[PDB]
Amino acid sequence: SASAVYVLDLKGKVLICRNYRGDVDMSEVEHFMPILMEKEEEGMLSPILAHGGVRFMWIKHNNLYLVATSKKNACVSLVFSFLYKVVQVFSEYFKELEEESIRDNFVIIYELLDELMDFGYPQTTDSKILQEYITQEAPRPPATVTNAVSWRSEGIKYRKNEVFLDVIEAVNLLVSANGNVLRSEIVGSIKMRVFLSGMPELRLGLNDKVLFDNTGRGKSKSVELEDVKFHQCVRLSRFENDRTISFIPPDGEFELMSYRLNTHVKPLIWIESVIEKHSHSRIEYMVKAKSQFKRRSTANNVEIHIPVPNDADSPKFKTTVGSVKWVPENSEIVWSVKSFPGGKEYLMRAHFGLPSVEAEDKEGKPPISVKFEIPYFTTSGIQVRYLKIIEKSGYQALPWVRYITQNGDYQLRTQ
């Protein structure tokens, strides 16, 4: 229940503001910057600010803080969801999130803000629906918003019905400094870019453990996702009733389902780090990486970031496979590898000097994270059964999907 949502800037200048209820004066935004500065200087800065009896919730954007001032005890979750929807709409409409587009599309920005929500209650949130009624370069509102199916616009015609799926896998491993993995969770991502004619209703079917158990086929490799979140077009009633994933696919790229379950398997890459740091004399980087993934799978664009000393200089790298580059801005050496086949063993030997004068304050031990991304690999073993594409007119669809495995929160605790 934010009184007014405004877009700020890095210098504190409000790029654009639009009051929704009028219960909060527009002058409260000026005091938001000093409050944020005081909180940052004292560590008390929070996204949800509080200017007396009015709370100015702000979200750190790419170039400006999306401050949404509120007066009463409005739904914080609802305000956050509205801000996220507005950010997504802006990203869809404007490819750049900076001050360049804030002052360049104000004429359409004001109309979009007015149409998005009224009296603090959001009304329009579909990017396609908003673009079909508000454009930067007006007819009556589309019937899709008024109709029940607000995620699949009717009347779409395409020469061919091709849908591109993406089996995105996020391998997050939390290995402590003792060598034991604490947080090992893999979050699935079923994103499909449906581009066909009409408004077909997708009939999702995969090798789900729950579905296999219900159908009596709970003996093969079935993916048991601890948390599965359906898309907006996905009907929750069918999923709750018999796990039937029946919903109208969106027009374009959309996230239908997102699996999320813990992983009890060994990490795809086993990295052993050695720190032979002398007392203000030299430093040793005994980094050894072992590929625990299948040999048939190669990790493309693997970048194992090893945090080097903050004041370290004149470093020498003695590695075997993969180029190592030290970035002064990042204050660490990333073990960049173009192609890393499964089972590969890369050994590195860092050697650099240190300044004679010791540091005045400690800098901490940031965890070592890798940027491995091996596609065409299904670590979870979940196999899609079929995709029920049904249209009233009747057409033969040719859906496509690719399985991509990448490294997410694969951070290794430093010694």
Partner: peptide
């Protein structure tokens, strides 16, 4: 081709489930 796994054809449903 494309990095991250080549696109593969998908069926319509589980033909073995009747």
């Amino acid at each position: 081709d494309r990095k991250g796994g080549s696109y593969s054809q998908a069926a319509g449903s589980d033909s073995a489930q009747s």
